[PDB]
Each structure stands twice: as structure tokens, then as C-alpha cells.
Symmetry: D2
Subunit: 328 residues, 4 copies
């Protein structure tokens, strides 16, 4: 991968986020998703890569754009691409917290080619966190005890994040019984997982079941930021098992570590759509100095150098014109 594509990825997530923000709070999940997909595809085809979508909007039969296997880019180094044009379509439609646009790139085969199934996840931040600090087969209590010891705090200081779902009741109960503080997000476990390794997020541990593509994207970010994560694909019927087999996955109970989900040279980029526990959302700003503009907040990182860049971008815009001029 050319060093240039890292910083080019942030332009993609910025344009996707502005498109999504034009649909924020319009109550149309589909329109928000479509605005993001359009902008991200358009932006991607200007990046100097020979890219193949390995995680994206879905299979070609269900997704006309950014489908698994689609070729993207203007030509260049060959890369596998893990996309989320809009992480949080419902989030964005309701103006909720933790909506992001996400783009990750790897050398060929770098990402777990994961099906659209659920995935158990446990994640903690810290560059010094050793392999095995978290393990899905151990109890919540033991994982949290090891994490508290590694961070040098009493159990009661720990903030565990999980999604507000019935499937997480037991997690929430056990964590709380062993003394930790457990906070709940409505949607957005990409942001929720990455927040374990984000400065001043207030979140120490993520534990929960969510989308498998979302789990891989989070693992790419954690590979760059430092931390440990374990994941395990869940299968509820024969159709899901068939998706797995179609993507080359046959060990259905495998526990994946970070290196199994995203390996080698990884670039991760994200932009906030709404305010979240990882990134701030797009905002309209006035000024006589430069006129009105939209502000976006992004992060781009790469696993080889561990360099992390936080980017605040000012995009000229006349808010007397309709906001949907931010689309494509």
C-alpha cells in the first residue's frame, strides 16, 4: 500500500459523512443509507487503488453498489476494502449518538471475510494489554477482574459498555454484581468497541453481540490503536451457516483474535456523523472570517506505523441552499 492511500481514505469518509448528515433526523433510514453509499462509492472511485470490496453493503443480489466482490478505485496498489458507508442508518435517521462512516484497507486477504451474521465480542484498550486478557469462554467476572488488575483500578471504577438489548441482560447483571459500572448504548458497537482505546471516551471495556462486519471494522481500528479483542461468529439457522461456507468459513465455533480479524498492514479511517463516544458529529458553523461551513471530525490510522491522526475539516457551504446539496 502506498502511503498516500491512508490520507486519501479520510476524504472518502468525510464525503460519506456529509451526505449522511444531510439526511440526519429525516426519519428515513433507507435514504440516509443510500446517500452515504452514493457518496462513498463516488469518492472511492477517485482513490488510486485496485480495490475489492470484501466487507460492504451486502451481496450483489441485494446491494447494487459496494457489494461483496465489487471492484473499486481509480487504479493502483491492490487492496481489500472493508466498508461501512453509514454505521448507524437508524441512528442517523433519528439523530441518535454514535453514527459513523468507516473505511478500512488491507493487503489481499487481510480481513476476515465475515458473513452477515451475529458475532460475540469482547474488547479492551491499551497497547500493553497481553493476549488472553479477554476471552469469550471465561466468565464476565474473571475477564473484568483481569482488566481491573491490568488497568490498576478497583472493579467499581471500570466502565463496561454494551448495547441495550435483551440478549445482554446476563452480561449487564453479572458485571454489575461484581461491582462494575455498565453503560448502555442504543446502537453503534463500532464506536462502542473502538471507544475502549479512545482517549477520554470514558469507556474501558466493551462486551456484547453485534454485527460481524462491524466487529471486523472495530478490530481494524483496535489493531492500529492498541488493545485486545476476541470475537466468535454465531449461527442461528442453516442459511447463515451457508453464508459462512460460501465465504470459506467452516470452523463455526472459532474464537478470532484481533490478528485473525485484521492482519498485516491495515489503514482505518472514520468520520463522525452524529456525536458519539468515539467522534464528534458534523456541525453547521457561521463566521464572517470565512463564511459558513460544515465541520467534520475524523480519525485515520495505520497499523504498521501506529501513527494516528485526528482531523477537523472545514467544508464551505451556503446553508441558504438546501442541505441535500451535500449528497454525492
Amino acid at each position: 500500500m502506498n502511503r498516500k492511500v491512508a490520507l486519501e481514505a479520510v476524504r472518502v469518509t468525510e464525503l460519506a459523512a456529509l451526505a449522511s448528515w444531510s439526511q440526519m433526523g429525516r426519519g428515513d433510514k433507507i435514504a440516509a443509507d443510500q446517500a452515504a453509499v452514493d457518496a462513498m462509492r463516488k469518492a472511492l472511485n477517485e482513490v488510486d487503488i485496485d480495490g475489492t470490496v470484501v466487507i460492504g453493503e451486502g451481496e450483489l443480489d441485494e446491494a447494487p453498489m459496494l457489494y461483496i466482490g465489487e471492484k473499486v478505485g481509480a487504479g493502483g496498489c491492490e487492496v481489500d476494502i472493508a466498508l461501512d458507508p453509514l454505521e448507524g442508518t437508524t441512528i442517523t435517521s433519528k439523530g441518535g449518538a454514535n453514527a459513523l462512516t468507516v473505511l478500512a484497507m488491507a493487503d489481499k486477504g487481510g480481513f476476515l471475510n465475515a458473513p452477515d451474521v451475529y458475532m460475540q465480542k469482547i474488547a479492551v484498550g491499551g497497547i500493553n494489554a497481553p493476549k488472553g486478557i479477554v476471552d469469550l469462554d471465561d466468565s464476565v467476572t474473571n475477564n473484568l477482574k483481569r482488566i481491573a488488575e491490568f488497568k490498576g483500578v478497583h472493579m467499581s471504577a471500570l466502565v463496561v459498555c454494551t448495547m441495550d438489548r435483551p440478549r445482554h441482560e446476563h452480561i449487564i447483571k453479572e458485571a454489575r454484581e461484581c461491582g462494575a459500572r455498565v453503560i448502555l448504548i442504543n446502537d453503534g458497537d463500532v464506536s462502542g468497541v473502538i471507544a475502549t482505546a479512545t482517549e477520554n471516551s470514558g469507556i474501558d471495556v466493551y462486551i456484547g453481540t453485534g454485527g460481524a462486519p462491524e466487529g471486523v471494522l472495530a478490530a481494524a481500528a483496535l489493531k492500529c490503536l492498541g488493545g485486545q479483542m476476541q470475537a466468535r461468529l454465531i449461527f442461528n439457522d442453516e442459511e447463515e451457516i451457508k453464508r459462512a461456507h460460501r465465504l470459506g468459513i467452516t470452523d463455526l465455533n472459532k474464537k478470532y483474535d484481533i490478528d485473525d480479524l485484521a492482519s498485516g498492514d491495515i489503514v482505518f479511517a472514520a468520520t463522525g456523523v452524529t456525536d458519539g463516544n468515539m467522534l464528534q458529529g458534523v456541525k453547521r458553523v457561521n463566521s464572517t472570517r470565512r463564511g459558513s461551513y460544515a465541520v467534520t471530525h475524523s480519525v485515520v490510522m495505520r497499523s504498521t506505523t501506529k501513527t494516528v491522526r485526528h482531523i477537523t475539516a472545514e467544508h464551505s457551504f451556503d446553508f441558504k441552499e438546501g442541505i441535500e446539496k451535500f449528497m454525492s
Copy 2:
């Protein structure tokens, strides 16, 4: 009011927030409320005021502490006090957004003496916003057209905030049908209303029905920040109408403007408990330079001077002990 009480009010809201934070994500709404009430009462009794609670936890037969009429303070200038020890008890218990501790002070009779009933609210920020820019008897569409013209933006740029409740469905649809973006909060319409006059909140208008004491608190802050707000009390049974009558209110459909809710010299102080659209919440911080500490984020403001102060406070704490050492 002596100028000193303004800055002493932030110490009160800070201690209340740290006590509340020790209960964040513990799933105990009652214990979070009680930690906040205890810390706020203890800190209030060290403020050099002759204070009378006019907005508080409730009536004495239902609230043992910080009840309507309670005398508080170490002695000094006479003030009416509007309190919210924890705005967002459920929020705090679940670690959701927009939880605050709030303390406002006025000269005697400065706050609307309303019963604890629902209140229709409409609020916009801006020092130059004229009286009448918002009116509860006009349609959502006409209010929003006037706001869009005053702010100099297309209707689609406006971000209207309201709570995610069935009672707001009509508002949601109409705003969206006229072209605006409408974002939903799960709770905390104090922060929701104050966000309209808060820099970089990304919220332009609040329209919703919520608690009347919360409406008064938000109006006090807006009196200091600059903005317009109209309220109308709602009565759902004969006992609530009786409450109004015993307090001297017979015009049940009265539209209160910002000056009717909070008049004269007003001091307003608030500290974040969780991250919200007005203030950031408490965080645990490490440093070799000063050791570990909790950071609080507060605001204090005064209507006479319009001076606004944003306070970031570092409170030393050894997080090897239990977090509940932050309780008073």
C-alpha cells in the same frame, strides 16, 4: 446577590455530579438520585446564602431533603433556589446521554411558582432573537419558518430537538414535513433546551413537552445565554388544577415567556454527569504528573452581566479505592 455566590454554586453542582457519577451505570435510579441529593444538600449548606428551595425534589411529605420551602445555606443574601440534584436519574443509572446536576438562584419571587405538572416548551437561542419569534399557538411550520429566517438558513438546515415519546409524534412529522431535520433524545430536556443557545451543540430549536421545573431551570439558563422560550402548563386531572389554584394560578392556558419563568438577577450553574449536548460528563484520568483524578465540566452564568464561565475541574482521587468514596 453578592458576586461570590455565583462561583460558589459550581462547587455545589460539581460535588453533586461526582456523587451521581459514582452510581452511573449501576442500574439503580433511586441510589443515583439519593447520592446526588445528599451531596447537593451538604454542599449547599456551606454556601453563604439565606436560601429557600422553590424548585426542588418535591413536597416535604414526599421528599425528606431539598423539598419545596426548605431553608438552606450558611447565611447571607436571601435567594430563592431552583434545584435539580440529578437531572436524569434513569439516564445516570443507564449511563445514557444528557445527565446534569443543576442549581439556579434568584432574588425572592424570581422563579415561576408552578405545580409539578407537564409543560409545553418551545425554545430557540440567540441574543437578537425577538420576543414572539416562537409562540405555542402558532403551528410548528410557522415557528420553524420564522426561526429559519432569523438564522438565515434554508429550512432543511435547521436541527430541531425533541424527546423520543409518542406525545411528540405530531411535532416530529410536521417539522419533517416542512423540511427540517429532527433529532431525538431519550431524556433530559433541560440539556435539550439549553443546547439551543450553547456553542457547537448542533441544536437550533427545542420543541417538546416535559417537566415544568425543568422548564424553569432551562429558562433561567436561556435568560443568561440569550434566547427566547415560551411555555404552557398542562393539566391532566382535577387534582393538578387544584395544585395550580392553591398556588394562585387560574389562567390554565397562560403562555409564559422567558421573563415569566425566571425574572430579575439569575445565577445558573450546571455540571455534566454523562456526556450530553450541553456539557461533557465526568471522566477518570491518569497522569504521572499529578496522579489520577476525576475531571468535571461545568458552566456558571449570570443574567445581569451575561458573563459565562466554562469550568474544567481536576479532583484528585485514587481509583484503587471504591468509586463510592465520591459520595458525601
Copy 3:
């Protein structure tokens, strides 16, 4: 001291900074100093203390004089004062100009004459007494500081003032491998920077005013760190001042506890941008109109609580700026 006075102090420094700022870059050192003094005295007299100025603008010509009684009535406090640390700074619009107030219980501050003072300072709550000492070599001081901070010598940033009298310090610190950065003026800011987050300054070594050293020590006692100071006597009459104040060990080395002891409150507000605080700025907004923004810090040694205050003060900049004077 009541907890109330801590937060009242910051209002004092903010008002002094706004009045100083009205005179920033006007090339009138005297007018700056007078605007600052007027604002600070008027604000101090509304604070509920029986205050006594023990360190201030020492010559009456330069009205917050040694021994003056200030305050509206309350607990007895000694007041260590600088209405404007950097009169020349503010008048030139140079870096590191501050307004500063420290308070202690009676006798808490060193009673030092208006003489020069050798200083060495480092930040860090865990730094032990003896990490810095004015009789050890610059080299050995820096070796201990590098070890304490866990960095290579070459990473250390030493701050001193750009004066001939610091040539030897500068040479030796660079000889041993450290980076040495120079400030035009403002060794209050320069010393406190050693314990300020993101200042980029690890150590201060230099000679400056004794009052400024006491003020910096008061802040370091709240922020965490170590400092040593020694008074310098060039004239017979400076020695006589010292004798008049009960000092006969002229070569005494003062640790921080000797400079500022007991319960200490320290407050400062930036006038110009510097290595500890940001300076006052003019801001526009449709939302609240125009305002001046001040950046302040207030801290207390007993609790170690530190508050950073960003304050927005309404102002019509179509009117002359000197309406910010008291």
C-alpha cells in the same frame, strides 16, 4: 481560609487581566501597570478577607504596597500579589504576561526583599526534595530529572530567560545533551510551566525577581513539583533590606515549603499567550454578540484541586477598549 475565597481570587485576576489587555501593545509600561493595579485593588476590596499585602508592587509608585490592608472583612490572609507580571511584556505584546494572586495563612509566604533570586524548578507530584539543588551542577540536576521522568537527556526541555547571566546555564545544559529554550521575559509563567500539562517545558533554571519566585512556588505547591531558590545580594542596601526583614543567612537555599507553606490558594489569568495560559481574545458571535475571552487557573494546595476557567465577558468593541479598565 473559607473555600469561597479560592474562587473569588479568580475573579480578581480576570478583572486585572482585562484592564491590562486594554493596554497591551501600547508601549506604555506605566499605564499598563496602573490599569492592572486599579482593577486588582477594586476587585480585592470586594473579597471577604482581612488581607494584608506581603508581596506586591513593592514601591508605592509601582498602591498595592507591602503592608496595605485589603478586602471587605473575613479570615486573615497574607496576599502575594502581582497585578501584572510582565509590564514590559504587556506593553510590547510579548509572550507570557499574566495577572497573578496568591493567598496564604498569616506568615505563609517568604518575606523576601525586592532582590534577584536564583531559581531551579521541576514538575511532578512524585519528585522528591533534593531532585534539584542550586549547588549541584546543572548537569547533575538534569541527569536526576531525566531519570525521574524516564527519558533520555536529549528529550528534556529546559527553559530560561534570554539574558547574559544565563549563558553558562545554557551552555552546560546543551553540553550535557538537553534542549534549552529561551523566553524574553516571564519567569512566573516559565517556572509554573514545568508543572503545566502540554507546556512542553520540563525544567526551569534561571535568575529573576524574588517576588516572582515566591508566586511561582505557591503555584508549584498546588500543582506538584519541587523548587529551590537562593537570594542574590549585589549592594549594601539590598543586604540592609534583608536584615530589616530578619534575614541574616544571605546564602540560604529556600525549598518550596520555605517559599510558600501551609494552605495556599493560587489564581492566574493570561494577558498574552504564553507557556502556561492563553491570553485574552476578542470574539464575535451572532449567538451572544461580541465578548472578550479570558483563560484562568485557580488551585489550592490542601485539596490539590485545579480548575481551568474560560470566561466570556460581554463587550461592544465599537466602543474604546479602555472601557475594560476599572
Copy 4:
């Protein structure tokens, strides 16, 4: 110019800034300059451009690297390049304020090919400022009266920045006489001119004489941020006139508008070396999640889009190792 080169320019300025920072406060302006030159040339040759140095380190007879005319880059779109490996070598050697590293790119002929001579400069920020607001032949007083009118402030509110030099005494005296506030910098009139269009700089106007290539670099930035500037080359001896003639300039008293200094599509990038009135300098940071790193603060901007990006970058480093490891 491809959109990718904009964000690639920042990597160049960041690497030059890190290398300069390793020499900060070492009292060796030659060594600081050489570290910056080496790092900038090595980073530039990885940028996908066909570049020609029009403003650089010097003429080939005096500068072996980054000399006027040198071809640089890895190959790509053709660009003229205006370089300052280290703006403020003496600054950086003393750890003084306002040192920057600077890289700007334009379409061919975009920059004034300026000789190494002094240049009178006057500059003001603001997208609405009209050509003629500043003019070197009007008095300081009349320039300042127009700028006060344009900004809507009393003359006493204005802050004029200039360098502390004898040649500027008349400026300083007249500006103070007409009522403005005049703040002085020891060095760094690239930063000082750009500060006029930087948010919260506190600097309204820059007036003074400095390096001509520095004037062109600042003009490039102002063309992206919005502002007006006028410049005039001045000549002290025959050698300096010859420097002008060698570059095709015989109209020695020409006044250059901002469009004469930098025109067309311009990308401008800069990174702080030391804290200054436009950018913060490099800092050493410790973290209990990421380890130690150096933080750089950069900006990159483009005149066609007016997009401005503020970039905070975290560069992994073990500070137990010698700081000279930042020289690449």
C-alpha cells in the same frame, strides 16, 4: 493537481517538523536547518508529483538540496513547489515562538518566483476584504482606519503584529499614535501574516518587512484562508538587484497584490515546530493506553475548494532513545 497530493503534503511538513524539533533549543541554526532539509527532501521524493522547486532553500551554488529549479517527487501531476524546510532556523535553535515547516504546491507559474531579498508586506484576513483595503503607499493610519471599519470595531480594538526590528519603529509609532495595539514578534512573519486569517490568533493586521520567499508562502496560505495582502520587493545593493534580474524581474518597485504572489489552484500545508501565533509546536506526550508519542499540529488547505483541515498527529516514539532518532 490530484486531490491526493493535498493530504500527502502534510506528511512532508510533519516529518520536517519532527526533525527540526529534535534540534530545538540546541543553539545550532545550521544543524536545525539541515535536519529539516534532509527530512523534507526525503519525504518529498515519495510524493506522487512531478515538482519543480521555485521557492526553496537557495540557489544550487549555495544549497545542494531543495534548490531553485530542482526536480522533486516520485512522479505525477506537474506542480511548482514553494518550500520552507524550516521557517525560523534561529527561532528553532533558541526554542523561540512561531517556527513552522511549510510546503505549498501550485500549477506551473502559480507562485511569484521571488529573489532572496527583503519585501514590504501588509496583510489582513477575512473572505469579504476587498482589494485595496491594504496598500503600501497609503499611510499606516489610513490602512488601519479602513480595516477597523471593515471589521466593525473601534481602532483601539485592533491588534497589529510586526517584528521587533529598528526598521519597524515608524510603523509601531504610527499605529500606536492612531490608537491601535501593536504586538511584537522576535521572528516568524510567515506565521505572523497567516495569523491575520487564523481563528483565535488575536492578530488582525500584519505590517512589516521580511523575506520575500516568506511573503510568497504566507500569500499562498491567505489565498486559501481568505484575505488581502500587498507586497513590494526592496533592494539594498547591486547584488540584490542582480538577484531580481536573474529571475526576470526588472520592475523593481512593482507592488504585488496577493494574486500576483500566488494565483490559481494552490495547496498549502504547514506544521508547527514551536508554539506560535498560527500553530502549536511539537510536544512529548505520555499515555496510559498508547505509550509515549510526539504530537504534531498541522494545517492543510486548498484555494479552489477553500477546504481547511486541522490535523493533530500522534507519532509513536520511545523517549528513552535519543531524540535524534526523529531525523530521517
